[PDB]
UniProtKB/Swiss-Prot annotation, chain A:
Shown segment, full-protein numbering: 114 to 546 of 548
Organism: Homo sapiens
Compartments it resides in: Nucleus
Taxonomic lineage of the native organism: Eukaryota, Metazoa, Chordata, Craniata, Vertebrata
Subunit relationships: Component of the 7-subunit TFIIH core complex composed of XPB/ERCC3, XPD/ERCC2, GTF2H1, GTF2H2, GTF2H3, GTF2H4 and GTF2H5, which is active in NER. The core complex associates with the 3-subunit CDK-activating kinase (CAK) module composed of CCNH/cyclin H, CDK7 and MNAT1 to form the 10-subunit holoenzyme (holo-TFIIH) active in transcription. Interacts with PUF60.
Annotated protein name in UniProt: General transcription factor IIH subunit 1
Compositional bias per record (Polar residues), positions renumbered to this chain: 212-224
From Swiss-Prot, chain B:
Protein name, per record: General transcription factor IIH subunit 3
Disulphide bridges: none
Stored InterPro entries: TFIIH_Tfb4/GTF2H3, vWFA_dom_sf
UniProt main location, coarse: nucleus
Source species taxonomy: Eukaryota, Metazoa, Chordata, Craniata, Vertebrata
Annotated source species: Homo sapiens
From Swiss-Prot, chain C:
GO CC annotation terms, alphabetical: core TFIIH complex portion of holo TFIIH complex; nuclear speck; nucleoplasm; nucleus; transcription factor TFIID complex; transcription factor TFIIH core complex; transcription factor TFIIH holo complex
PANTHER family: GENERAL TRANSCRIPTION FACTOR IIH SUBUNIT 2, GENERAL TRANSCRIPTION FACTOR IIH SUBUNIT 2-RELATED
Assembly: Component of the TFIID-containing RNA polymerase II pre-initiation complex that is composed of TBP and at least GTF2A1, GTF2A2, GTF2E1, GTF2E2, GTF2F1, GTF2H2, GTF2H3, GTF2H4, GTF2H5, GTF2B, TCEA1, ERCC2 and ERCC3. Component of the 7-subunit TFIIH core complex composed of XPB/ERCC3, XPD/ERCC2, GTF2H1, GTF2H2, GTF2H3, GTF2H4 and GTF2H5, which is active in NER. The core complex associates with the 3-subunit CDK-activating kinase (CAK) module composed of CCNH/cyclin H, CDK7 and MNAT1 to form the 10-subunit holoenzyme (holo-TFIIH) active in transcription.
Modified residues (Phosphotyrosine): Y86
Cross-referenced PROSITE patterns: VWFA (PS50234)
Main subcellular location of this protein, as a coarse class: nucleus
Described function: Component of the general transcription and DNA repair factor IIH (TFIIH) core complex, which is involved in general and transcription-coupled nucleotide excision repair (NER) of damaged DNA and, when complexed to CAK, in RNA transcription by RNA polymerase II. In NER, TFIIH acts by opening DNA around the lesion to allow the excision of the damaged oligonucleotide and its replacement by a new DNA fragment. In transcription, TFIIH has an essential role in transcription initiation.
Name of the protein described by the UniProt record: General transcription factor IIH subunit 2
Effect noted on mutating C299A: Reconstituted TFIIH complex lacks p62 and has no transcriptional activity
Annotated localization: Nucleus
Organism of origin: Homo sapiens (Human)
Gene Ontology molecular functions: RNA polymerase II general transcription initiation factor activity; zinc ion binding
Lineage of origin: Eukaryota, Metazoa, Chordata, Craniata, Vertebrata
Gene symbol of the encoding locus: GTF2H2
Zn finger spans (C4-type): 282-299
């Protein structure tokens, strides 16, 4: 927890004033601040080139195993560590020969110089890992027996003991099998070496989450290229049903909002004798009346010359052309009134909002009396005094002046109030013993 | 640069324009549109490139007053660009015969609008919403008319004169949000009542909303304000600054609320007085909707 | 042999109907090459308030060109467009930009809806080496633990940009099926120019939809296919409550200029490190800061701003369709019900209900921009009841 508060100076600057202004404790600091990022923020050091490394690094362990005589020790995993992070009994073997090669740097070259080429028989430690890997494949033999399905080692064996043959099918090699004895020895070990590298997945597949079912062949395997399984099945009338009732509710209640309803029906009621149509008669008469009046446009020749109605039209133009007396210089103390609260109190207030949001949260479920924990019902009580006291001296430091203070304190008292709201509302649901 | 198109949406409520005559006004519908006509011509007076779009709102329809829909412009379709080889209406022009090229076509078609006083469709009032897109498709084609070194500066005028109608609230809101995609200014002068909804549409645009001071006094603000370019207003320092707009009520009972809550996945935010879903017959999953009723 | 055979490929292509009218039908086949998949929508059920997770393969597959100078250049550029067109269509949601690079996963931008932060992150993501191999297990680990603390009233979908390579990660990601099947989190990948069976089995075990990138046009299609909030698996949620309606504040209401700036480390709100003068106001914190139609950090509820986001999908579902006829019923004076023109490329577009005549430029303008036929208006609202 302490490396977290030292490597991050911003959160440390947050963590300072809970000790500096004595807001909360460290016990209270790690009780309601983190609580989620214990999985999220700690997801960096655990993964680190995908831990439980099975099939990510194993592609690149052999090409990046050597740059030079000393091209090693990059960072943490650089080019040596995840080699150790797969072999376990072979890691015990590494530990066995570090004093045999004295210097660990010497070990980095020696233990891996002869094992890389063909074969490593120079030291007990190299021979330990060498012999173990034959036992590993012997150990890996027994596991493949337990699966034993889709494995024609079974199916091949039925045809060779039966005539006592397929020993000649083994012993029928052409192409000068007489006088070399070099790569015959060599390649089968490289066959063995990369099957180790192949079973290095298997040596790390157990690290994944132990990964076992071992295949009792599941005798169905129904070749299903046909059938039309068609996995997803929506459209069993779900938003069809919403549309039938909500537009019905948007029909019977079309916009019952602020201006959206109250001015609406009030002027529809003003239309009055509209089913009586006597207003509609005069309407349709006035539809018939000014029908002809528009088109002549001699009446609509001079529907312009009213400079009587220009002056007033010029007036509220000029009235809105000059608003006056509204404190043109509204700032210019704001720089002093920025740097003093945005030195501590930006972060100080943030100490509350990391907590006070949870203070809204436990009360956001409390009358159900389910999330009622002693960890929480006194966490209601805990930070209550831990915040509403530690703001009072930041409150009392700024009441050094009067109108310099009374403007900003109109906006800080919400913090006092949202505290006391929560506290005030806490007993609106009276809790028993 | 560019071509500088104008769009004008005029309220023509003959219920209300009949009611405009019921007071025996000193400002009638005849006095209305003629200002709006020359207002449309005023657009044309800045540049030969300027193009106009005029559509009123009849109770049954909204026919394109401008450009036209009859045999005077069904075979004419304007003189500049793709000519009809039409002599008489293709002959006289220059600041005064262009207007009587368009004066005729409005008064003949409002004649076709004001001969249909035969409404029996249960007060089918101001049908702004569907009338809006009638421009928007057409200018999309006009976007596809020429664009080659031709920025289409369209500008939408909305004129309100009466109350809004009972139209579909979604189909109210969406086209503005589609106009929000469309990047075209929309400006609004109202006459009689305020429209909180349509002034929200102005807020979407950042256009301009206007309550008129007086209906016969609608010739100087209409001159100054409802006047184009977004250049004349981003440079002309005179903006109606007011735009007081509180909103956000809910739909089950009636409210004015700061806290909403949805009823189903269907985006139905209702009033708190709501046991069972009136958005559907699908019941609410019983963990959350009584927590609206818990605290 | 091949010197002829290299040009037997040209023999037929170059040649056409000769005499007169040459190099003509070759252009006709190019128009006949066009007109790919239109919509095939019409769905119901789910899709609301997604919580997306951008997952990016950063690998050596990017170094192949194949569409662009980099496959990230194919990728990253249109993601910004995909970001903006998402926030266009779906503002009720938020997206987790998480980057896999060198066998780990970096949650680059947090699950949020602030576009500039996401886009400049992509503008920061330009000069990425994409060193190392993909690891989805680290990506799903962030994806779990983050969305684990999200409510079950949240749409839980993951968008993986995978470069079709070997899924280089341990720790039984096949067993992450039952992990996430139970966790009701959807995972959607699309393969870059190839296929991963295990990931293809993953998505078909998910309900997330898998595809393969064909081309840059085709790349856009599946983005566009995943713009829409899809009908995910049943039994996710019904409701989501304490949708905070805010206030805009003008800071000129009663006391004119009584506060030089409405962000001074004590005011209810003032969340982000910048000066402000009072524009906004939330119900529950009574939080006044820079305007944001999303949510907050102290009231912790959703800063819903209804005309924006309670309007976006609010007409994105209830659509209908048109029809096409090549015939000539000459409705209008050989006109369109919308834009009022004519070309007659035998696509006379008729509505299903009001039955009005439209063009492509009126059909597209509906089916991409207007999303409804306004011919239904004047036809719905007049007898509506
Ligand atoms: Zn609902
Ligand atoms: Zn709050
Ligand atoms: Zn059309
Ligand atoms: Zn229609």
């Amino acid at each position: 927890k302490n490396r977290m508060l030292q490597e991050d100076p911003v959160l440390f600057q947050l963590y300072k004033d809970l000790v500096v202004s004595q807001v909360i404790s460290a016990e209270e600091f790690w009780a309601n601040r983190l609580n989620v990022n214990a999985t999220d923020s700690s997801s960096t050091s655990n993964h680190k080139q995908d831990v439980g490394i099975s099939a990510a690094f194993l592609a690149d362990v052999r090409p990046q195993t050597d740059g030079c005589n000393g091209l090693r020790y990059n960072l943490t995993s650089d080019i040596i560590e995840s080699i150790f992070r797969t072999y376990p009994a072979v890691k015990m073997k590494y530990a066995e020969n570090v004093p045999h090669n004295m210097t660990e740097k010497e070990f980095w070259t020696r233990f891996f110089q002869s094992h890389y080429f063909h074969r490593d028989r120079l030291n007990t430690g190299s021979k330990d890992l060498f012999a173990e890997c034959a036992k590993i494949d012997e150990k890996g033999l027994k596991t493949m027996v337990s699966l034993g399905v889709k494995n024609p080692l079974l199916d091949l064996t039925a045809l060779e003991d039966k005539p006592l043959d397929e020993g000649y099918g083994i012993s029928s090699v052409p192409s000068a099998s007489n006088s070399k004895s070099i790569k015959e020895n060599s390649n089968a070990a490289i066959i063995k070496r990369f099957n180790h590298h192949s079973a290095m997945v298997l040596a790390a597949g157990l690290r994944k989450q132990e990964a076992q079912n071992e295949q009792t062949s599941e005798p169905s395997n129904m070749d299903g290229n046909s059938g039309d399984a068609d996995c997803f099945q929506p459209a069993v009338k779900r938003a069809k049903l919403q549309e039938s009732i909500e537009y019905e509710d948007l029909g019977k209640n079309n916009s019952v909002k602020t201006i959206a309803l109250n001015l609406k029906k009030s002027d529809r009621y003003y239309h009055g004798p509209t089913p009586i149509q006597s207003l509609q008669y005069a309407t349709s008469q006035d539809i018939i009346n000014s029908f002809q009046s528009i088109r002549q446009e001699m009446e609509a020749y001079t529907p312009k010359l009213t400079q009587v109605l220009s002056s007033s039209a010029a007036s509220s133009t000029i009235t809105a052309l000059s608003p006056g007396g509204a404190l043109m210089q509204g700032g210019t103390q704001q720089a002093i009134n920025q740097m003093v609260p945005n030195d501590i109190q930006s972060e100080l207030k943030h100490l509350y909002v990391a907590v006070g949001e949870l203070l809204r949260h436990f009360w956001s479920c409390f009358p159900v009396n389910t999330p009622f924990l002693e960890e929480k019902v006194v966490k209601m009580k805990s930070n209550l005094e831990r915040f509403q006291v530690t703001k009072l001296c930041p409150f009392q430091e700024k009441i050094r002046r009067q109108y310099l203070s009374t403007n900003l304190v109109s906006h800080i008292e919400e913090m006092l109030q949202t505290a006391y709201n929560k506290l005030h509302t806490w007993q609106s649901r009276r809790l028993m013993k | 640069d560019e071509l500088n198109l104008l769009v004008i949406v005029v309220d023509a409520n003959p219920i209300w324009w009949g009611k405009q005559a019921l007071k025996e006004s000193q400002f009638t519908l005849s006095k209305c549109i003629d200002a709006v006509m020359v207002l449309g011509n005023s657009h044309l007076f800045m540049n030969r490139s300027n193009k106009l779009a005029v559509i009123a709102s009849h109770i049954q329809e909204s026919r394109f007053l401008y450009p036209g829909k009859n045999g005077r412009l069904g075979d004419f379709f304007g003189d500049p660009g793709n000519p009809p080889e039409f002599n008489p209406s293709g002959s006289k022009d220059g600041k005064y015969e262009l207007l009587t090229s368009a004066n005729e076509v409005i008064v003949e078609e409002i004649k076709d609008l004001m001969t249909k006083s035969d409404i029996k469709g249960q007060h089918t009032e101001t049908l702004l919403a569907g009338s809006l897109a009638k421009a928007l498709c057409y200018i999309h084609r006009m976007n596809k008319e020429v664009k080659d070194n031709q920025e289409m500066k369209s500008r939408i005028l909305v004129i309100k004169a009466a109350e809004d109608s009972a139209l579909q609230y979604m189909n109210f809101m969406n086209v503005i949000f589609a106009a929000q995609k469309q990047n075209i200014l929309i400006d609004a002068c109202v006459l009689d009542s305020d429209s909180g909804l349509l002034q929200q549409a102005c807020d979407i645009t950042g256009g301009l909303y206007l309550k008129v001071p007086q209906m016969p006094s609608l010739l100087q603000y209409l001159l100054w304000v409802f006047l184009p370019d977004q250049d004349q207003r981003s440079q002309l320092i005179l903006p109606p600054p007011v735009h007081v707009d509180y909103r956000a009520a809910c739909f089950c009972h009636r409210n004015l609320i700061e806290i909403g809550y949805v009823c189903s996945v269907c985006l139905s935010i209702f009033c708190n007085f709501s046991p069972i879903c009136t958005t559907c017959e699908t019941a609410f999953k019983i963990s959350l909707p009584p927590v609206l009723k818990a605290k | 042999r091949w010197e002829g055979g290299y040009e037997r490929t040209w023999e037929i292509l170059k040649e056409d109907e000769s005499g007169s009218l040459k190099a003509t039908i070759e252009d006709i086949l190019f128009k006949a090459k066009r007109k790919r998949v239109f919509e095939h929508h019409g769905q119901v059920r789910l899709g609301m308030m997604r919580h997306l997770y951008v997952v990016v393969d950063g690998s050596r597959t990017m170094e192949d060109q194949d569409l662009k100078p980099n496959r990230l250049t194919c990728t990253l550029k249109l993601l910004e467009y995909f970001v903006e067109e998402y926030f266009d269509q779906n503002p009720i949601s938020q997206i987790g930009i998480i980057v896999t690079k060198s066998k780990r996963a970096e949650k680059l931008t947090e699950l949020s809806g602030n576009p500039r932060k996401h886009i400049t992150s992509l503008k920061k993501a330009v000069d990425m080496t994409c060193h190392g191999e993909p690891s989805l297990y680290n990506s799903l680990s962030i994806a779990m633990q983050t969305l684990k603390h999200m409510p079950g009233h949240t749409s839980r979908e993951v968008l993986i940009i995978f470069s079709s390579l070997t899924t280089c990660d341990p720790s039984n990601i096949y067993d992450l099926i039952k992990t996430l099947k139970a966790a009701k989190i959807r995972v959607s990948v699309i393969g870059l120019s190839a296929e991963v069976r295990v990931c293809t089995v993953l998505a078909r075990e998910t309900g997330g939809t898998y595809h393969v990138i064909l081309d840059e046009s085709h790349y856009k299609e599946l983005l566009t296919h995943h713009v829409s909030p899809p009908p995910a698996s049943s039994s996710s949620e019904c409701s989501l409550i304490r949708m905070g309606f805010p206030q805009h504040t003008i800071a000129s209401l009663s006391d004119q200029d009584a506060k030089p700036s409405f962000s001074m480390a004590h005011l209810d709100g003032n969340t982000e490190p910048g000066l402000t003068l009072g524009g906004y106001f939330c119900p529950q914190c009574r939080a006044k800061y820079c305007e944001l139609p999303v949510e907050c950090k102290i009231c912790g509820l959703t800063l819903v701003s209804a005309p924006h986001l309670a309007r976006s999908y609010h007409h994105l579902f209830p659509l209908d369709a048109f029809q096409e006829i090549p015939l000539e019923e000459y409705n209008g004076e050989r006109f369109c019900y919308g834009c009022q023109g004519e070309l007659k490329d035998q696509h006379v577009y008729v509505c299903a209900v009001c039955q009005n005549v439209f063009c492509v430029d009126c059909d597209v303008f509906v089916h991409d921009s207007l999303h409804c036929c306004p011919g239904c208006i004047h036809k719905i609202p007049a007898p509506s009841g």
